[PDB]
Amino acid sequence: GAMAQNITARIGEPLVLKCKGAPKKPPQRLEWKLNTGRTEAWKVLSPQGGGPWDSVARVLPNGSLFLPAVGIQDEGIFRCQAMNRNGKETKSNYRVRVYQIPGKPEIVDSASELTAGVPNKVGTCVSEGSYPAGTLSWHLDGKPLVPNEKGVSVKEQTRRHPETGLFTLQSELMVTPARGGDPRPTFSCSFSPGLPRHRALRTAPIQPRVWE
Amino acid sequence: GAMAQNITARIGEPLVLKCKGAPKKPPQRLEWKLNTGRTEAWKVLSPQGGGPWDSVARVLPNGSLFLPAVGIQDEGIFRCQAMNRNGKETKSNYRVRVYQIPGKPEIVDSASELTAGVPNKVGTCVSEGSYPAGTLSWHLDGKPLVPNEKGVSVKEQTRRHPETGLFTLQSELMVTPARGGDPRPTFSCSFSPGLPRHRALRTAPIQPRVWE
Amino acid sequence: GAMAQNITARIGEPLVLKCKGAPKKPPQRLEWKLNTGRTEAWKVLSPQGGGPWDSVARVLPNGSLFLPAVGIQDEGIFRCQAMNRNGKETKSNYRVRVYQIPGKPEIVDSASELTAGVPNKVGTCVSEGSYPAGTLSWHLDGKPLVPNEKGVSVKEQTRRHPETGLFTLQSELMVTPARGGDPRPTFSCSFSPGLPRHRALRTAPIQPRVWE
Amino acid sequence: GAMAQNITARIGEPLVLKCKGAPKKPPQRLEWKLNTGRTEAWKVLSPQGGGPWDSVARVLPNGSLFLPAVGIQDEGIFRCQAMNRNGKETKSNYRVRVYQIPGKPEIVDSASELTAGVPNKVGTCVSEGSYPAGTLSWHLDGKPLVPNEKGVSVKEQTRRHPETGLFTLQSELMVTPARGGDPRPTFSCSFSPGLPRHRALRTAPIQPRVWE
Ligand SMILES: Cc1cccc2c(-c3ccccc3)c(C(=O)O)[nH]c12
Ligand SMILES: Cc1cccc2c(-c3ccccc3)c(C(=O)O)[nH]c12
Ligand SMILES: Cc1cccc2c(-c3ccccc3)c(C(=O)O)[nH]c12
Ligand SMILES: Cc1cccc2c(-c3ccccc3)c(C(=O)O)[nH]c12
Ligand SMILES: [Cl-]
Ligand SMILES: [Cl-]
Ligand SMILES: [Cl-]
Ligand SMILES: [Cl-]
C-alpha cells in the first residue's frame, strides 16, 4: 500500500483521526475513505453523513473522523483528502490496527512434585481476552524455556470467544529435570502481545520440589 | 472435506441440527464439533454445555444442536458423533451456509426518453439486504441483456451494511438503441441469489420512449 | 466500492484492460492501481514498469494493462487514471473475477437396480477443475430433484487441487422410489458455474430399473 | 482448536512430521489429515498415496509426513492417527506456521545534517523478503524511538512480492531535535520477526550532524 501513519486502537474505546489540512470549522471540502472489515473495498464518508454509517463513524465539526467504540471489524485503512480555504489539498493516510489486552495470565494444574530424569507436567498457563492472539512462553528461574531444547516439551491451544472474537490461549509445559539439578526450580509464564511495544504480562511463579 | 449434508440457514432464524443415532433422551454419549466463523479450528460442545457458547449453540435433550438466531459467522461445518444404547457409533456431518433475502429490487433514475443511435442511461437497479451478495441483471422485453454485446454497457457497485454485513447491489444500464427499433421497449432488472434453488426477484418494468 | 465495469477472466488466459482516455502512444501521463490477491492494498504500476511486476502485469504502448496468464490471485480491482493531450483526466474502474471451466461432469458408481419403497444409492456425480467452486444438482426425467423433498437425500463433498487451487465436487444421490412409479426413471447431474451467464454442463443420463 | 505441538517451518525447506505411535515400517494402520491453505477443510493422506498430493506431501516408510519444500499455503493443522502392533491408538497434532527471514535491513536516503527545533527526515529503512510481515522500528543511541512521543514521527509502508508473497517493509523516520542536544546522534533501524524467539536484524548505524 502507500505510506501511512500507524494507529493502534483498543477495542471498545473511541478513536479520533485528524483530517490534516481541513479548515477548523464548516464549511469544508473534505472526504474520508475507509476500507475495513466493515466495507466492500472503499466506502466514502462526508461531513453531511447520514445512513447506517452514522452509528459507526461520523465526521466531526473540525473534519476529524470519530468512531465511538472501535471493534475488530474496524481494522483497515482510513484516508482523508481536504482543501483548506487557500485551495491547497492535503491527504491523510492511516493504517488502523486494533487490540485488546487480556487479563493477567494464570498457571492452573501446577505440579507440586517433579521427578528428575523423567517427563513431568509442570502446569498449564492460560490467558483470556487478547486481540490479536499473542503468544504464551515459559521461563525457568528467569530464563526463557525453549521447546526445541532437550527435556522441554510444550503443547499449545487457541480458542475464541464466540461473541467477542477475543482469544484464549493455553500452554502446557512438560520438563525432564536432569539428575543433579536444582531441587526447587522456579517457573513462570508470560503473555507477549501481538502488537509492537505492548508490554508482556507475567504469571505468579511456581516452585515445585524435584526428587532425585 | 468429507461428504456432508448441505444445510441452508436464513440469517436471524433458528437452526436445529439432528445428531443421528443419539438416544432419545439423556444420558447420551455424544459430542458436537463445529468449525465456523466463530471458532479457531474445531470447538467441542457437549450435552452439559456451560460458558459463553450457551448463548450461541446448545445441545437439546434429544441431542440435537440448537442455534436460536443464525448469523453470518455461523457458516461452517457442524459434526456430531453419538453412541446409541446398543454401542453403535453414528456420525453426522453438516455443511451450513447462511443467507438473507433482500427486499424487492427497484429501478431508480430511469430515463423517460432514449435517443436511437447514441448511448443512453436507462436506469439504475438497486437491491438491499442480501447474503451472499448475489447479482443483478437486466432484461429487455423478457430477454437477458448481455454487456459486451454491442450497444449494451453495465456498471456495477457493491456495498455492505456496516452493522449487519448484508449487501446492497447497484447496477447502471446504458444502451445504444438501434435505428428502426421498438419505440416503446420494456426493461426490467432481476436479483439472482447466490445459493442454488433460491428464486430470482424482479423489478417492475419500465417503458421509455425511443426517438428515431 | 465504486461503480465498476465487471470483467470475467479465464484462468491461464491473457487479460487486456483498456485505460480509457489515454493517448494512443507514449508519452502518456497515466497510472494503474490494482488491489488483488497479489497486493497489500493498492499497488501502483506505471508505463515505465520495472521490477518483479514486469513478470505479472505490464502497461502496453497504448496504455492498456496486460497480464499474460491470469491466476486466481489476480481477482480484485484494477483502476487507471489518464490525462489526454488536452489535459482532460479520465478514470477507468474494473472489477476482475476469474474462473475456470471444469471437465464434463461424470456419474460414477451408478446403480443398475433400485428397489421401490426403500432408500437406494443412485450414483455419485463428479466434476473436476472448476473456479469458483460452482454446484452440482440432480435431475429426474428432466426435472430438478430437491433434497428437501421426501424420498430424496443428497450428500456433497468439495476438494481442491493442492497445486492449482481448482475445485473437485462430488454429489451422492439417494432416493426412495414410491411404489407404483416409473420402472425405468432417467437421472442426470448438472454442474452450474459460480459466475452469472456461464452455461451449465450435464452428464450423460442413467436409467436404472426399479423393482416393485 | 485442540492442544497441539507448534511447528515453525521455513519457506522453501523440507518439513518432516512424526506420526507418533506408528510401527517402524510398513504395513501400518495410520492416516494423516491436514487442513491448510491448500485444502477445503480436512484432506486425508494415507501410506499408499497417489494423485497430485504426491507432489506436495507424502507419507514415508516410517509413517512420517514429508513436504519437500514448504510454502505459504502449507500453514495449518496436520494430524496423524496410528495403531501400533499392540492395537494401541496414538494421535499426533501439529500446528504448522511458516516463515521467511528477510535480507539484512538497510537505511536509504539518510540525512547528513539535521536542524534542531524543526522536523527533519532522518531516513528510510527497508527490509525485503519476510514472512509473516514483521515490523520495523527505529532506535536512537541504542534506545527505542517511540512515535507520538514529542518530536518523533514515523510513516510505514508494506508491499508484497507478486510471485512469492514475501513482504517488503519501509519505515520513514522524522525527528525534531531538541535544542542543546547531541550534535552527532546515532540512529539505527531493526527488523522484528513475526514469530516468537526469532532474532531481530539491525541496520548499520547512521550519525548525522545536528545544527543548533
Ligand atoms: C495515497 C493516498 C493517501 C491519502 C489519501 C488518498 C486518497 C483520497 C482519500 C479521501 C478522498 C479523496 C482521495 C487517494 C485517492 O482516492 O486518490 N489516494 C490517497
Ligand atoms: C468425517 C466425519 C463426519 C462426521 C463426524 C466426524 C467426527 C467427530 C464429530 C464429533 C465428535 C467426535 C468425532 C470426526 C472426528 O473428529 O474423528 N470425523 C468425522
Ligand atoms: C473511484 C475511482 C475509479 C477509477 C480510478 C480511481 C482512482 C485512480 C486510479 C489510478 C491512478 C490515480 C487515481 C482513484 C484515486 O486513487 O483517487 N479513485 C478512482
Ligand atoms: C484432537 C485430535 C488430535 C490428533 C489427531 C486427531 C484426529 C485424527 C487424525 C488423523 C486420522 C484419524 C483421526 C481426530 C479425528 O478426526 O477424530 N481428532 C484428533
Ligand atoms: Cl474456538
Ligand atoms: Cl461498503
Ligand atoms: Cl481438499
Ligand atoms: Cl503490494
Last residue in a domain, options C43, C76, C101: C101
* Inter-CA distances, B66 with B30, B52, C162, Å: 15, 14, 35
Spatial strand order in the sheet of B201-202: B143-144, B135-140, B187-192, B201-202
How many Cβ atoms from other residues are within 10 Å of residue D198's Cβ? 14
**Chain D CB contacts of C40 below 8 Å:** 158-160, 167
Residues C207 and C116 in one domain: yes
Which ligand 3 atom is nearest residue C42's CA? 16
- Written as one string, the DSSP assignment of B134-179 is -EEEEEETTEE--TTSTTEEEEEEEEE-TTT--EEEEEEEEE-PPT
Residue D14: asked if its preceding bond is cis (omega within 30°), the reply is no
Residues A118 and A194 in one domain: yes
**Chain C CB contacts of B196 below 8 Å:** 135, 137, 192
**Could you give the 3-state DSSP secondary structure of residue C54?**
helix
Spatial strand order in the sheet of D29-36: D5-10, D89-99, D76-83, D29-36, D43-45
Does A2 sit in the ligand 1 pocket, CB within 6 Å? yes
Residue C191: name the closest of C122, C110, C137 by CA.
C137
**Could you give the 3-state DSSP secondary structure of residue A39?**
coil
Is D155's CB within 8 Å of A197's CB?
no
Which residues are CB-contacts of C159 (< 8 A; sequence separation ≥ 6)?
B1, C167, C168, C170, D39, D40, D43
Closest residue to D4, CB basis, from A2, A6, A156:
A156
Calculate ∠ Cα C16-C18-C20, nearest 5°: 175
Calculate ∠ Cα D41-D42-D47, nearest 5°: 155
Buried-state track D21-33, b at ≥16 Cβ within 10 A, e below 16: bbbeeeebbbebb
What is the total count of domains within chain D? 2
Which residues share a beta bridge with B99? Answer: B10
State the burial class of residue B114 (Cβ atoms within 10 Å of its Cβ: 0-12, 13-18, 19+): buried
Is D162's CB within 8 Å of C56's CB?
yes
The Cα–Cα gap between D186 and C161 comes to 53
**Chain A CB contacts of D4 below 8 Å:** 155-157
Residue A55: name the closest of B161, B69, B167 by CA.
B161
Residues B210 and B108 in one domain: yes
Residue D81: name the closest of D35, D40, D46, D38 by CA.
D46
**Could you give the 3-state DSSP secondary structure of residue B196?**
coil
Q: Which parts of chain B are beta strand (E)? A: 5-10, 15-17, 29-36, 43-45, 58-59, 65-67, 76-83, 89-99, 106-108, 113-115, 120-130, 135-140, 143-144, 152-160, 167-175, 187-192, 201-202, 209-211
- Sign of the CA dihedral running D43, D48, D53, D59: positive
The Cα–Cα gap between B148 and D72 comes to 38
Can you give chain D as a three-state secondary structure string?
CCCEEEEEEECCCCEEECCCCCCCCCCCEEEEEEEECCCCCCEEECCCCCCHHHHCCEECCCCCEEECCCCHHHCEEEEEEEECCCCCEEEEEEEEEEEECCCCCEEECCCCEEECCCCEEEEEEEEEEEECCCEEEEEECCEECCCCCCCEEEEEEEEECCCCCCEEEEEEEEECCCCCCCCCCCEEEEEECCCCCCCCEECCCECCEEEC
Spatial strand order in the sheet of D187-192: D143-144, D135-140, D187-192, D201-202
Locus of grid cell 497479489: C38
Chain C neighbors (3+ CB pairs < 8 Å): A, B, D
Is C197's CB within 8 Å of B156's CB?
no
What is the DSSP pairing of strand B120-130 with strand B106-108? antiparallel
Closest residue of chain A to B71, computed from CA coordinates: A163
The Cα–Cα gap between A133 and A100 comes to 9
The Cα–Cα gap between D48 and D61 comes to 10
Is A39's CB within 8 Å of B167's CB?
no
Buried-state track B2-31, b at ≥16 Cβ within 10 A, e below 16: bebbbeebebeeebebebbbbbeeeebbbe
How far does residue A92's CA lie from ligand 1's centre (Å)? 8
Which residues are CB-contacts of C52 (< 8 A; sequence separation ≥ 6)?
D161, D162, D163
Residues D83 and D156 in one domain: no
Backbone φ, ψ for residue A53 (5° rounding): -65, -25
- Sign of the CA dihedral running A191, A196, A198, A199: positive
What is the DSSP pairing of strand D58-59 with strand D43-45? unpaired
Locus of grid cell 456495477: B156
Which residues are CB-contacts of A46 (< 8 A; sequence separation ≥ 6)?
A30, A31, A32, A59
Residues B76 and B111 in one domain: no
The Cα–Cα gap between D43 and D78 comes to 10
- Sign of the CA dihedral running C18, C23, C26, C27: negative
Residue B112: name the closest of B101, B103, B121 by CA.
B121
Nearest ligand, CA B81: 2
- Put simply, whether C5 touches B (Cβ < 8 Å) is yes
Which residues share a beta bridge with A43? Answer: A34
Residue A5: name the closest of A18, A14, A23 by CA.
A18
**Could you give the 3-state DSSP secondary structure of residue B206?**
strand
> CA neighbours within 13 Å on the CB side: how many for A102?
32
Residue B156: name the closest of B175, B131, B130, B137 by CA.
B137
Residue A206 DSSP class: B
Residue B193 in grid coordinates? 441469489
Question: What dihedral do alpha carbons C49, C52, C54, C58 form, nearest 10°?
Answer: -70
**Chain B CB contacts of A159 below 8 Å:** 39-40, 43
> CA neighbours within 13 Å on the CB side: how many for D66?
12
Residue A180 in grid coordinates? 543433579
* Inter-CA distances, B8 with A132, B15, B198, Å: 31, 9, 10
Which ligand 2 atom is nearest residue B42's CA? 16
Q: Rounded to a whole number, what is the distance in Å from the CA of A162 to chain D's nearest CA?
A: 13
Residue B89 DSSP class: E
Residues B89 and B153 in one domain: no
Which residues share a beta bridge with C173? Answer: C123, C154
Residue among B53, B131, B160 with most chain A CBs within 10 A, to mutate: B160
The Cα–Cα gap between B43 and B32 comes to 8
Give the helix/strand (H/E) hosting A192.
strand A187-192
Give the helix/strand (H/E) hosting C66.
strand C65-67
**Could you give the 3-state DSSP secondary structure of residue A89?**
strand
Which ligand 2 atom is nearest residue D42's CA? 1
- Put simply, whether C115 touches A (Cβ < 8 Å) is no
Residue B121: name the closest of B84, B67, B78, B176 by CA.
B176
Nearest ligand, CA C20: 3
Residue among B32, B78, B163 with most chain A CBs within 10 A, to mutate: B163
Which ligand 2 atom is nearest residue B30's CA? 11
Q: What is the largest CA-CA distance in chain C?
A: 82
**Could you give the 3-state DSSP secondary structure of residue A129?**
strand
Is C154's CB within 8 Å of B3's CB?
no
State the burial class of residue D138 (Cβ atoms within 10 Å of its Cβ: 0-12, 13-18, 19+): buried
The Cα–Cα gap between B36 and B76 comes to 4
Can you give D86-125 as a three-state secondary structure string?
CCCEEEEEEEEEEEECCCCCEEECCCCEEECCCCEEEEEE
Nearest ligand, CA B94: 2
- Written as one string, the DSSP assignment of A58-83 is EE-TTS-EEESS--GGG-EEEEEEEE
- Put simply, whether A78 touches B (Cβ < 8 Å) is no
**Chain C CB contacts of B157 below 8 Å:** 1-4
- Sign of the CA dihedral running C168, D1, D78, A73: positive
How many Cβ atoms from other residues are within 10 Å of residue C174's Cβ? 17
The Cα–Cα gap between B95 and B75 comes to 8
Residue C74: name the closest of C87, C56, C60 by CA.
C56
- Put simply, whether C146 touches B (Cβ < 8 Å) is yes
* Inter-CA distances, C14 with C29, C57, C94, C196, Å: 25, 10, 16, 21
Is D1's CB within 8 Å of B77's CB?
no
Q: Is C63 left (phi over 0), alpha (psi -120 to 50) or beta?
A: left
**Could you give the 3-state DSSP secondary structure of residue C44?**
strand
Residues B65 and B106 in one domain: no
Last residue in a domain, options A42, A69, A101: A101
Residue C58 DSSP class: E
Residues C1 and C94 in one domain: yes
Residues D97 and D113 in one domain: no
Backbone φ, ψ for residue A107 (5° rounding): -100, 125
Nearest ligand, CA A43: 6
CB contacts under 8 A, B 45-74 vs A, are 52-53, 55-57
Residue B197: name the closest of C12, C135, D56 by CA.
C135
* Inter-CA distances, C176 with B90, C139, C184, Å: 21, 15, 14
What is the DSSP pairing of strand A65-67 with strand B106-108? unpaired
Does B190 sit in the ligand 2 pocket, CB within 6 Å? no
Instruction: Name the structure determination technique.
Output: X-ray
Residue A107 in grid coordinates? 498457571
Residues B110 and B212 in one domain: yes
* Inter-CA distances, A40 with A15, A44, A91, B159, Å: 21, 11, 22, 5
**Could you give the 3-state DSSP secondary structure of residue A101?**
coil
Last residue in a domain, options B56, B86, B101: B101
Does C155 sit in the ligand 3 pocket, CB within 6 Å? no
How many Cβ atoms from other residues are within 10 Å of residue D67's Cβ? 20
Closest residue of chain B to D42, computed from CA coordinates: B1
Residue D102: name the closest of D165, D167, D164 by CA.
D167
- Written as one string, the DSSP assignment of C97-116 is EEEBPPPPPEEES--SEEET
**Chain D CB contacts of C39 below 8 Å:** 159-160, 162
* D86 contacts D183 by C-beta, under 8 angstroms: no
How many Cβ atoms from other residues are within 10 Å of residue A44's Cβ? 12
Is B39's CB within 8 Å of A158's CB?
no
Does A20 sit in the ligand 1 pocket, CB within 6 Å? no
How many Cβ atoms from other residues are within 10 Å of residue B36's Cβ? 21
The Cα–Cα gap between D28 and D13 comes to 27
- Sign of the CA dihedral running C141, C144, C150, C154: positive
Residues C58 and C106 in one domain: no
- Sign of the CA dihedral running C13, C19, C24, C26: negative
- The boundaries of the domain holding residue B133 are 102-212
Chain B neighbors (3+ CB pairs < 8 Å): A, C, D
* D70 contacts D83 by C-beta, under 8 angstroms: no
How far does residue B166's CA lie from ligand 5's centre (Å)? 24
* B130 contacts B198 by C-beta, under 8 angstroms: no
**Could you give the 3-state DSSP secondary structure of residue C17?**
strand
Residue A110 DSSP class: -
How far does residue B78's CA lie from ligand 2's centre (Å)? 9
**Chain D CB contacts of C161 below 8 Å:** 52
Closest residue to A162, CB basis, from B52, B165, B167:
B52
Residues D33 and D108 in one domain: no
**Could you give the 3-state DSSP secondary structure of residue C165?**
coil
Which residues share a beta bridge with D40? Answer: none
